[PDB]
Design a protein around this ligand. Structure first.
Ligand SMILES: *Cc1cc2c(cc1C)nc1c(=O)[nH]c(=O)nc-1n2C[C@H](O)[C@H](O)[C@H](O)COP(=O)(O)OP(=O)(O)OC[C@H]1O[C@@H](n2cnc3c(N)ncnc32)[C@H](O)[C@@H]1O
Ligand SMILES: *Cc1cc2c(cc1C)nc1c(=O)[nH]c(=O)nc-1n2C[C@H](O)[C@H](O)[C@H](O)COP(=O)(O)OP(=O)(O)OC[C@H]1O[C@@H](n2cnc3c(N)ncnc32)[C@H](O)[C@@H]1O
Ligand SMILES: Nc1nc2c(c(=O)[nH]1)N(C=O)[C@@H](CNc1ccc(C(=O)N[C@@H](CCC(=O)O)C(=O)O)cc1)CN2
Ligand SMILES: Nc1nc2c(c(=O)[nH]1)N(C=O)[C@@H](CNc1ccc(C(=O)N[C@@H](CCC(=O)O)C(=O)O)cc1)CN2
Ligand code: NA
Ligand code: NA
Lengths: 827, 827, 104
């Protein structure tokens, strides 16, 4: 098997060694600049609290696996997990409501937990001064990891299986040739490798710069304090590091707690963000590293801890009879969005990262990476962990610094899923931005792009709207980053004509004599059709899982424009094209460009779309001028445009693409043409609700690599008859009808209880699914939610969706909910 | 020699046959759908007035050649030119002033002419009612062409030399294979060809669509009327078509005149534009074509002519005793900018156009095309005639229609060289457009781009400006599309820091394993330098003439960004890259993209540029961070940018390139950083004056293919030591010192008489040059003009520049006028 | 309906605006209204100041109810008012001219 070098003998790198070994890959060298007995990264100081419950399904499965593995990781009859459970307490109404949402995550992801009353909290954790406790969330399977001990036992069992450990060995560079890794440099010459995995914790960026790779993590310090012996605790625990009470979270004050014998450990994020320059740390001579003297531990700054110490004494008064014994400012990693950084680099074949990973998720990440390395894919969706998810503006040191600090500042906050950052904003805007501002655009952002969710100009339309379009009141939570205005935009889209900004849609140009050959192998469609055809198709992995759903427009013999889902797709195409070019003839070369930023697109949609466009174009837009899912070049308002006839909102019209410098003119020409037809600008709130009424899938939530096309209801898009395509062999014999799990459309019975995503779904009182996407449907006048459900659950069955602790009755409904016979889309 | 098919036996196509023959290329078939004896295009109805004098040097040389050739084109002792001279009369002060400018063109282009007083006009042309005549411009060598007769004599002499003519033969298509022309389709099968030249007059667009080529001409009708016998004219001329008086232009009333025996011919553009659908003309059966029955002649619409007929009787009262005998609405071509359309198509190798050409320029265009075909280049600069000069937005049928009609409406107007159209405007704007509007940008346009010439916000700076920067008053003509504000912008650029919009600069990405190989052959620089280098270099033709001056930035091993001069360059690179790819290995492929529209650029220039940028970037901008004429990637205001250190304005700073979606943020970050430093936005008026103070050349005026690098003072940019590059062999042994003509900088002695361009330059009372570029120099505080001058004329000599009839004393000055030791540009 | 005390109408809006309205829009004014006047409650331009603000000025989280029609941005505007200089639109303040020999 391939020669693997792992950089880092933290909890990540030693778990990864371990996960590779058990899969038969043992040609591994593990390097660490610290001594093997105590390498001295963040793992060497972590207190090891593990709270599994997480808004993210993947992160939650990573934590569940880590708990399982640490419990099994044992020597002299002592495991590496002490399963005391975990308790998060609420001291405000906002937090108590949020614990109900978190209990929802628990059930969604298969973690057992309960909400505790104030009295039951006191019974479980008598040290709590009960006066400000409104409630708790108790997960019995949570607990304390012994991460440093786990590292030592992983080293020992992997060593026996052939893995080589070199402590006191500093990586100073990475050797490469022809765009693949060939070795790792040390002052002692090069260690050959076919695969390098950087498991270097908060040194990740420094390692990354050695190959020109932006690794978007920031090292940040976080205070951890142990008290002196707490009188109330005398005699209760085994010394020196026993614990019997659940690990304790006090998220309203940025604090968490564990016992260490009769002492308390207090973790505080209740301080200013503290960026750390890794180049200033110094080279620690290995012989010098000890528990208080290691690169990860900076001097304690007591002044930062004072407020945390007061809140502690308030929550746990017994602690007022102890003192602060020892504290440090410990360094670990943060990232712009709080997700880890995993996967193959863009810059260098065979070079991977598994960085910015808490002890909590370590074994999970290791296992995914081991699957990635040995089989070509991870069994768990890595959409939110892949290093290549980031856009170029999100990779600058300044972006990483500013947003990673804000993620530290907010780490324990209750936040709505649509909550935008206040800064940095306005990084990327489409060419319609000034016009969007004139119309009172309410902008949210993703990928650096500013995106209108609705337009305040259209509030003037609410008085004219037919009552059937008026939605009911929303609760405060579903009402955040939402507006009644979206009803009006949905209304006008369904009955007049609307202009949506499609500019942020990932746009890739795949070009050259090998373009068709590349796309024919990567996609599930037969793309060898005369130019003009637009095909909705999938990208799969070799296990048939859905990596993406895409459109491919063939603009000429050698030129294809793809509408993709984000930069994981870009990176996927980039590498696949480079590999075909390198091992092909002069007829296989192919380039991939991300042209998103240099172009723009208006989705011009609704029943008056042809009336509008005919005023500013002499091109033929009739059905016989341009059929559904066809593209051609046209001129609109004097601007050359590529017109594609499809609509993610389910109405007549076209995506109109042009170069950025032309976009404002193209916008103004249409806007003016559309005055007599009541044209509006329409934003993402309406867009999302309308596409949901159409049943159209959104990659990353409605389906990921954990789903095959037939489970996702996307069989129509797989052309099984193709000689060859990635995933074909895996999908032999499967059908939608025979899928054990299927994506179902739910409508909410009461017409008004909106859900948002991730809420667990119960059939006959058992958790069998979870909301993937949802919105209020303005056309059907009810909340809609999607969920996978067991194949045995049928159209017309009834299911419950738990939202903030309350069961909401919904019915499995046939989709599309709107115009399933596509009457609005054809001729 | 190659098999050539010419489409059209008009004055263009038969002259082209002729010009090819005399150059030894006689394998020619000439096709025309009309009968050979009277093909029935525009040539069959033209009255044949030839006024040589023209603002364009090339057009003027085309007309001079046409006069020479038609005079030599003779049979039975009767030539095809009747050299009666030409007279343009002025009936307003505006026109009289403009005739003085036109006399300037005459001397510039070597055409003999004089300005006539009202009395002398009466003596030359006694029929003129003298009362509104303020003056005339008389060119004795002008005259009347007999174009239909010239066609017949060209046919006869080319036929004898082997050329084949097929009349009554309709081209219905063009055959091609592998991107080159292979034949012309008729109902009688295919006529093979290696080279096709479309000489199809106003059918040009229809021919063009047969290969997918946009031919930006519009067919338009123009009225031409013959009177009955004019009493005053009885007995004076040979019948039936004699003429003795000069051809007569009456541009203030859109009219021109010639005698036909004792009748008058009146040409009127004094009517609404009359677009013609060529598809509605009908197929004329050849046997039916006669003088009054031909595809080019539409029914006369007398109502349109009435006002012209009145003005005629006012100018020439003798005509009031005649009547209108016959009129027609004759069709010919117009183009967006009034230039013809020449050269190789972008779409099809070997397929050329020579279309939208007046009888006046016909032989000239034919000769250039013959040179192009047989030698690879024209001896006359075709910058303003090349079909590939147009930008994509300028090629839509709607753009062509609207602007070609306006060119018809303005054909006889006095217009300032900076006069913008009012419509269509706002086609292309940079990402800084809203910000430019906030600052009161005064926008002119070229290439479809809106470009600020100055910013009204900066008027507030005039009260603070040191008096030495305050320019003198401008006359009305040089003051049009000019503002004192430009002095302030030049001032701030020289002493603080300015932000120029460089977005419209043609930007080409040349990429792939054959990129360096292509550029090494096309340019005069050795580009095989590690990435990061920016090189100013030339593109030449095989005769050493300068096609372009360019920058090449090597961004990576296989990736180069060029800053070019416009779409002639784009088209040149496109074809050259396609040809290398087709006849190369898998290591020679190369793509060219025009990324202008998807990107943007700020030129951040002036002595405080480093102070400004250091506030919003942690990249190293010091001299040791980025040397002059080097590029690197940086981050500014959170935006990835490519920074190139050069300055067409002569100051410290950088061109800052980024993708369009990032541009506004990049703008705002710099704007805000620049507040304490007094940053301004600066426009093209200042830019032009500043670059002139630096002596930097502008392709298309300061040099064209008619100049070699040494004549243009660009020897430094030619690396003669290179093994190989286009033009090298031609330039062996030449030096700047030995050049018979050299580009000289002139400063105007009086400090105030501004010239604009094209004004003739006299040494010791002889016309020896002409102004190529000019501006008021704000830094040296005097008007500057460039001109080629004989090598014998030296620095410190004195020359006169004629501006509106007045000699302005100027001195030949060493350039650069500003900072010639580059102290402002280095370290 | 359950309505927050600051809940604005969506229509009719923009009846009365001060002469600084275009400038307020450039700066990302969040407008509420009373008396027909549009009144900025805070300015989105000033969100860029939050990263520079001393921690002592940073407010705690708000519950959903007190957080409606409220923004952390107001902390920054209060900060700059107390330590630098701020421009408030006082235009809607009822202004009466009492004039004539009986005015006093
Ligand atoms: C600091 C901290 C972290 C922490 C915590 C409390 C504090 C104060 N509480 C946690 C909690 O209760 N629950 C939990 O799940 N995690 C908690 N953490 C975070 C956790 O400590 C880290 O996220 C995790 O330990 C990181 O693991 P990882 O294995 O990724 O990183 P590392 O332990 O830092 O090891 C990286 C190794 O790389 C070696 N290295 C780096 N550069 C080189 C070079 N050039 N050459 C050779 N080796 C290199 C390092 O020496 C290190 O050992
Ligand atoms: C109309 C007009 C033009 C004109 C003028 C007054 C009027 C009313 N006065 C002029 C003047 O005094 N001085 C001057 O210099 N020019 C004046 N003109 C303009 C002039 O007539 C034209 O610009 C010039 O004649 C055009 O010459 P050209 O050789 O380019 O074009 P053509 O004579 O129209 O011939 C084109 C031929 O192409 C053949 N054809 C077209 N399509 C086909 C196909 N498909 N197959 C075969 N043959 C084709 C046509 O039949 C035509 O003969
Ligand atoms: N050009 C384009 N590409 C894109 C999008 C888009 O809206 N436009 N997407 C935007 O997010 C994602 C793809 N999601 C989509 C999901 C469904 C349909 C759709 O039209 N479905 C029809 C297909 C009909 C057919 O193939 O015949 C259907 O399911 O009935 C389109 C895009 C990424 N790529
Ligand atoms: N990148 C870039 N490309 C461009 C321009 C530009 O301003 N920037 N041009 C804009 O119109 C045209 C080129 N004209 C130019 C003329 C002179 C110089 C210049 O810097 N000349 C220095 C060169 C010094 C050297 O090579 O060492 C000089 O003549 O001293 C630059 C561009 C087209 N290409
Ligand atoms: Na916090
Ligand atoms: Na006119």
């Amino acid at each position: 098997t391939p020669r693997i070098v792992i950089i880092g003998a933290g909890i990540v790198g030693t778990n990864l060694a371990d996960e590779l070994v058990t899969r038969g890959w043992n040609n591994i060298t593990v390097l660490d600049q610290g001594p093997l007995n105590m390498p001295g990264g963040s793992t060497s100081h972590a207190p090891g609290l593990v709270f599994q419950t997480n808004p993210s399904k993947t992160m939650a499965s990573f934590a569940k696996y880590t708990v399982e593995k640490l419990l099994s990781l044992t020597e002299d009859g002592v495991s590496c997990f002490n399963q005391v459970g975990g308790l998060e307490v609420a001291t405000t109404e906002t937090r108590l409501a949020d614990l109900k949402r978190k209990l929802g995550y628990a059930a969604a992801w298969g973690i057992e937990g309960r909400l505790l009353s104030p009295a039951e909290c006191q019974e479980l954790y008598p040290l709590l001064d009960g006066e400000n406790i409104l409630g708790g969330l108790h997960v019995p399977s949570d607990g304390l990891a012994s991460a440093a001990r786990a590292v030592q036992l992983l080293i020992k069992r992997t060593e026996s299986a052939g893995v080589t450990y070199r402590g006191s060995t500093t990586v100073t560079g990475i050797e490469q040739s022809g765009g693949r890794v060939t070795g790792v440099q040390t002052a002692d010459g090069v260690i050959p490798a076919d695969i390098v995995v950087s498991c270097a914790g908060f040194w990740g960026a420094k390692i990354g710069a050695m190959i020109g790779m932006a690794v978007p993590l920031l090292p940040l310090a976080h205070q951890y304090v142990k008290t002196t012996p707490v009188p109330a605790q005398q005699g209760r625990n085994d010394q020196p590091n026993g614990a019997r009470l659940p690990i304790l979270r006090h998220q309203d004050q940025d604090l968490y707690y564990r016992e260490h014998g009769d002492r308390y450990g207090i973790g505080s994020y209740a301080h200013r963000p503290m960026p750390v320059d890794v180049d200033t740390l110094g080279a620690y001579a290995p012989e010098t590293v000890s528990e208080h003297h290691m690169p990860s531990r900076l001097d304690f700054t007591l002044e930062d801890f004072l407020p945390a110490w007061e809140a502690t004494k308030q929550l746990l008064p017994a602690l007022a009879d102890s003192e602060i014994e020892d504290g440090f400012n410990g360094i670990f990693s943060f990232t712009p969005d709080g997700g880890p950084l995993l996967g193959e680099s863009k810059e260098l074949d065979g070079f991977y990262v598994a960085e910015a990973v808490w002890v909590t998720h370590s074994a999970g990440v290791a296992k995914a990476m081991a699957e990635l390395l040995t089989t070509g894919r991870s069994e768990t969706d890595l959409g939110e962990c892949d290093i290549t998810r980031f856009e170029d503006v999100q990779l600058t040191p300044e972006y990483v610094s500013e947003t990673s600090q804000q993620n530290f500042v907010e780490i324990y906050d209750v936040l709505h899923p649509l909550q935008p950052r206040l800064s940095p904003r306005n990084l990327r805007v489409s060419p319609f931005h000034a016009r969007h501002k004139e119309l009172g655009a309410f902008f949210l952002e993703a990928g650096g792009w500013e995106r209108p969710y609705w337009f305040e100009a259209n509030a003037a339309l609410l008085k004219e709207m037919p009552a059937e379009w008026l939605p009911p009141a929303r609760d405060a939570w579903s009402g955040m980053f939402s507006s009644p205005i979206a009803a009006a935009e949905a209304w006008k889209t369904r009955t007049a004509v609307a202009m949506y900004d499609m500019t942020p849609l990932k746009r890739l140009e795949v070009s050259g004599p090998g373009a068709l050959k590349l796309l024919q192998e990567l996609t599930t469609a037969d793309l060898a059709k005369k130019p003009g055809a637009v095909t909705y198709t999938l990208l799969l992995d070799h296990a048939g899982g859905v990596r993406s759903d895409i459109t491919v427009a063939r603009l000429s013999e050698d030129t294809f424009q793809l509408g993709a889902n984000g930069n994981i797709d870009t990176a996927y195409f980039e590498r696949a094209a480079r590999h075909q070019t390198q091992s092909g003839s002069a007829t296989d070369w192919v380039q991939v460009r991300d042209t998103t930023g240099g172009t723009c697109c208006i989705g011009l949609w609704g029943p008056l779309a042809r009336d509008l466009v005919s005023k500013v174009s002499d091109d033929d837009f009739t059905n016989d001028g341009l059929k559904y899912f066809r593209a051609k070049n046209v001129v609109i308002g004097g601007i050359p445009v590529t017109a594609m006839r499809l609509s993610y909102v389910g109405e007549l019209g076209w995506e109109l693409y042009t170069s950025a410098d032309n976009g404002q003119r193209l916008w103004d020409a249409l806007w003016q043409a559309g005055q007599p037809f009541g044209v509006i600008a329409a934003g993402r709130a309406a867009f999302s609700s309308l596409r949901l009424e159409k049943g159209y899938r959104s990659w990353g939530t409605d389906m990921t690599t954990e789903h095959d096309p037939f489970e996702a209801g996307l069989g129509f898009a797989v052309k099984m008859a193709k000689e060859s395509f990635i995933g074909k062999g895996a999908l032999e014999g499967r059908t939608e009808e025979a899928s054990a799990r299927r994506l179902r459309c739910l409508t909410i019975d009461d017409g008004r209880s909106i859900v948002l995503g991730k809420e667990p779904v119960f059939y006959k009182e058992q958790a069998v699914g979870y909301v993937t996407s949802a919105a209020y449907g303005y056309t059907v006048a009810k909340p809609i939610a999607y969920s996978y459900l067991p194949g045995t659950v049928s159209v017309g069955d009834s299911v419950d969706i738990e939202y903030f602790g309350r069961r909401i009755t919904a019915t499995v409904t046939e989709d599309p909910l709107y115009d399933p016979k596509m009457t609005r889309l054809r001729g």
